[PDB]
């Protein structure tokens, strides 16, 4: 577990509907939500991969489980029952444990994605912003929608705003 | 000027199970286990099954008098709880189960 | 008159999922029988509103 979902970020956003992970910006031009399309698509692709692996690896084949034996073949009937019961126990245990494992893997994958988004934004901003702690960042320099689109894109220009941020720090 | 990082949340009630936690609500889930049937015997591999209404395989193969009411190919045979009209004359059907196995999937 | 891949004494089964709960005795390419009640695979985030 990485510490983001149900942790440093204490809650999800119902208002954000364009993706699984995203940003909420508060400026002088207005507030808003904006999803991170790339991370969301990567997550969608990998979850689709996991579902496909779980489903499309069974390799079933034609069979007729039921067999009929007369009253003088009780041993063979009991052997058939033993085979059926053994397969049932194996498959039920494997299915339960597999689902239980993949569920934690999926949830931890999502938590890691959120943490990585946070770390990328933090490394971009450096000391130009202050970490409040809720998962938010307050800018020391007034920067508009272009600045936040650059931060989301990954092209924040640190030396451009370094001088302005130094004064207010 | 603030920029917050967050994640999606909805009003989903769907619950999954984890090795560490039970009754965990999630935004979406898929089903790996279906428990619904159409309540309806139907064709397998395209070929319709052979239905034996009141007869069994012994009666049908021997031509019981109560069986003229009843296919070149079939996928499987269907019996019924009231399939009692078989060997009307008392006796033994030698290797009857073997015959049932050999007659199940003719082409 | 249907077209099914898996048949059980109580009906046909859509063989698209790996596991089945309906009936042990089966004819055809059938999902594996498990004595379980719920098998849900998580695909989205944990819901924390």
């Amino acid at each position: 577990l990485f510490g983001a979902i149900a942790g440093f970020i204490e809650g999800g956003w119902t208002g954000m509907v364009d993706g699984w992970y995203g940003y909420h910006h508060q400026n002088e031009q207005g507030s808003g939500y904006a999803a991170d399309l790339k991370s969301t698509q990567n997550a969608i692709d990998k979850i689709t991969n996991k579902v496909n692996s779980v489903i499309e690896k069974m390799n079933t084949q034609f069979t007729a489980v039921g067999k009929e034996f007369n009253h003088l073949e009780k041993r063979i009937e009991n052997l058939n029952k033993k085979v059926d019961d053994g397969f049932l126990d194996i498959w039920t245990y494997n299915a339960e444990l597999l689902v239980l494992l993949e569920n934690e893997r999926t949830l931890d994958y999502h938590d890691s994605n959120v943490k990585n988004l946070y770390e990328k934004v933090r490394n971009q901003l450096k000391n130009n912003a202050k970490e409040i702690g809720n998962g938010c960042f307050e800018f020391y320099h007034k920067c508009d929608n272009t600045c936040m689109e650059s931060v989301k894109n990954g092209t924040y220009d640190y030396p451009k705003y370094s001088e302005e941020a130094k004064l207010n720090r | 000027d603030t920029l917050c990082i967050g994640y999606h949340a909805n009003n989903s009630t769907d619950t999954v199970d984890t090795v560490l936690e039970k009754n965990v609500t999630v935004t979406h889930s898929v089903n790996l286990l279906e428990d619904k049937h159409n309540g309806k015997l139907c064709k397998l591999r395209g070929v319709a099954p052979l239905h034996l209404g009141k007869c069994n395989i012994a009666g049908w193969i021997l031509g019981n008098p109560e069986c003229e009411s009843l296919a070149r190919s079939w996928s499987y045979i269907v019996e019924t709880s009231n399939s009692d009209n078989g060997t009307c004359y008392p006796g033994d059907f030698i290797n009857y189960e073997e015959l049932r196995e050999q007659l199940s999937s003719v082409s | 008159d249907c077209n099914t891949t898996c048949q059980t004494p109580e009906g046909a089964i859509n063989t698209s999922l790996p596991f089945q709960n309906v009936h042990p005795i089966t004819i055809g390419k059938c999902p594996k029988y498990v004595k379980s009640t719920k098998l849900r695979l998580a695909t989205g985030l944990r819901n924390v509103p």
Partner: antibody
Amino acid sequence: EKLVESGGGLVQPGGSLRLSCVGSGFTFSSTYIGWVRQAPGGGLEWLGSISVNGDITDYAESAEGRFTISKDNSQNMAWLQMNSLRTEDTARYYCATGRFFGIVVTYAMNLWGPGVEVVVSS
Amino acid sequence: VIQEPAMSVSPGGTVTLTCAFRSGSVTTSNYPSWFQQTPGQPPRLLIYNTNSRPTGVPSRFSGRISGNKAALTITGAQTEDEADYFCALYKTALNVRFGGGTHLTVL
């Protein structure tokens, strides 16, 4: 998750028509709606699309100036309004959207309605 | 948007369908999408975002961007893969353009 379309039928040339797409299993406040038609002989032709928030709507060259797309989230419905129909608009119309694991993907169209027949003959 | 009007495949064979612009190059930012349509049914999405394959699509469908054109490859074409194939390319997020379908025939 289903989309069902209604509102088609016979229209005289130069007339107007209104088509409704209704969604079941998901909320329209979390999805975009695209309208695409298919001529009886021919291929798919994208007509228009309305965004998730409803603020941005985009139309094709053959649909700009005549067609209006609107979305009501409360009723979970989307309306395509046709004005000044010609005889080239006789087609089967479709409302589509992209939804993967409960979220919207704008560059995908995997949820499709059955379509509704629109015939424009004099 | 340009596609080849018709292609032919032998059962169990491999085919590639090509989608390309009329006055430009096709790249990832255009988000190629591939659709399979039978004449009397609504279209079905096979590949989205050049690579991605939605759940339920058979694994024999793959997509890529070869040179300056998107390619949809069917490996091991079965009898059920006989349908029309459309390609969709995006200029902006919402603006789409379909191409004239390619009619694939299984021999």
